[PDB]
Design an enzyme around this catalytic site. Sequence first.
Site, PDB file in Angstrom:
ATOM      1  N   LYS A 199       0.817  -1.228   0.000  1.00 18.81           N
ATOM      2  CA  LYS A 199       0.000   0.000   0.000  1.00 18.81           C
ATOM      3  C   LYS A 199       0.852   1.281   0.000  1.00 18.81           C
ATOM      4  O   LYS A 199       0.442   2.263  -0.610  1.00 18.81           O
ATOM      5  CB  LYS A 199      -1.011  -0.036   1.164  1.00 18.81           C
ATOM      6  CG  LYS A 199      -2.184   0.955   1.020  1.00 18.81           C
ATOM      7  CD  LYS A 199      -3.219   0.723   2.131  1.00 18.81           C
ATOM      8  CE  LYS A 199      -4.368   1.732   2.152  1.00 18.81           C
ATOM      9  NZ  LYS A 199      -5.320   1.437   3.251  1.00 18.81           N
ATOM     10  N   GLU A 243     -11.914   5.340   3.048  1.00 25.06           N
ATOM     11  CA  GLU A 243     -11.905   4.675   4.359  1.00 25.06           C
ATOM     12  C   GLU A 243     -12.713   5.422   5.434  1.00 25.06           C
ATOM     13  O   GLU A 243     -13.602   4.801   6.017  1.00 25.06           O
ATOM     14  CB  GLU A 243     -10.444   4.456   4.806  1.00 25.06           C
ATOM     15  CG  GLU A 243      -9.846   3.295   3.995  1.00 25.06           C
ATOM     16  CD  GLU A 243      -8.329   3.221   3.936  1.00 25.06           C
ATOM     17  OE1 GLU A 243      -7.667   3.978   4.671  1.00 25.06           O
ATOM     18  OE2 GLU A 243      -7.859   2.461   3.045  1.00 25.06           O
TER      19      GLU A 243
HETATM   20 MG   LIG Z   1      -6.980   0.975   8.280  1.00 26.75          MG
END
Ligand SMILES: [Mg+2]
Length: 383
Positions: free
Chosen positions: A70, A171
């Site tokens: 990531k 998120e």
């Molecule tokens: Mg997270």
Amino acid sequence: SGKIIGIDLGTTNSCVAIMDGTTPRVLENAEGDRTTPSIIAYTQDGETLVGQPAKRQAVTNPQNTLFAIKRLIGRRFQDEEVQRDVSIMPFKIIAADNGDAWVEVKGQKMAPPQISAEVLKKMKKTAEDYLGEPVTEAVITVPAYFNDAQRQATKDAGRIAGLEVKRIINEPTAAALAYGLDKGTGNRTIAVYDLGGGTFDISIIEIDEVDGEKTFEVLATNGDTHLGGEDFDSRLINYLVEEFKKDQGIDLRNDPLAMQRLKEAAEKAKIELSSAQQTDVNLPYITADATGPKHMNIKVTRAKLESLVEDLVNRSIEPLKVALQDAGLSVSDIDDVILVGGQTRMPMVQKKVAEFFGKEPRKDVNPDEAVAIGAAVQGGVLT
Ligand SMILES: [Mg+2]
Ligand SMILES: Nc1ncnc2c1ncn2[C@@H]1O[C@H](COP(=O)(O)OP(=O)(O)O)[C@@H](O)[C@H]1O
């Protein structure tokens, strides 16, 4: 029956969740766990291992055990994050012919989406194993600050894993859906404090009821991409090394196998101290010398852990002030505070956040599960 999974594709871990009628359910993987380490190993004998099985073999195979992908995904090789990581990662980071940050695995050039796709394939199989049916649809989450290249590379990982990516969602927006901050009325300003294994994010999100439909806006974003639970583990590890130096003369930093055991034991003791006032770090046969095997046995109190990590907890506060200043707001303009990420389970973190905002954070969902749950809620809106 055409079921859409929610996937949290996290820096450190990954989580997969689903709509079970009106109720979100986080799923257990083939190892019994609701969280899967974001770790991908290419073994000497030709296997591709993902999660805790890859974590176990890592010290035997440092070149071909990939993690923190990531940090590379959708980035250029010259990005400051990537250049920082080149000299700390034990796997080989390279420039692609187009200047992208790639990896070399057993002599093969690979793009970060090809590695993250192995994590996504495990989340897909984890859903199929629970359902007893195929799964090919997903919502996948990214940090709010991710640009078009990082979003598109995350989409590419889902495609390579055999998923139709219905939607890339932020998120902290997924976290707001898991906490049910859509089942309200009028305007609503929220603070999302997110402390994962590697990163710290603060997002201020406006949420207006207008025209019968609920809008979502990221008003401000801040944080520290090098502040997470691994740093909390490192403070406890360094304490355990120095106490074992004082009590037995040995510097365990020389013994890389002892260090793999000590990291694992430090994380377990940290996690136990979120619900107990003290625990023991007991590692029999931790190392050996001319006089035979040594055994580590060290009591760790919650108060001792808290003193080792206090300045890490205090680092999370300055990005909150900047995020509020960029949004043009005060702590009193925040209606709800939500916590995300496994490291926010620490009582000290919850209390520091509650103290800063002057309100106790909500309790609707597990912090470590909220992103995957909200991806699943969003998937169920498209079903
Ligand atoms: Mg997270
Ligand atoms: N109960 C707990 N108490 C303290 N730290 C915890 C607890 N559970 C998990 N953690 C820590 O939280 C981190 C995992 O955060 P997580 O949200 O799963 O990562 P990601 O960034 O991939 O979303 C790790 O450092 C882990 O040790």
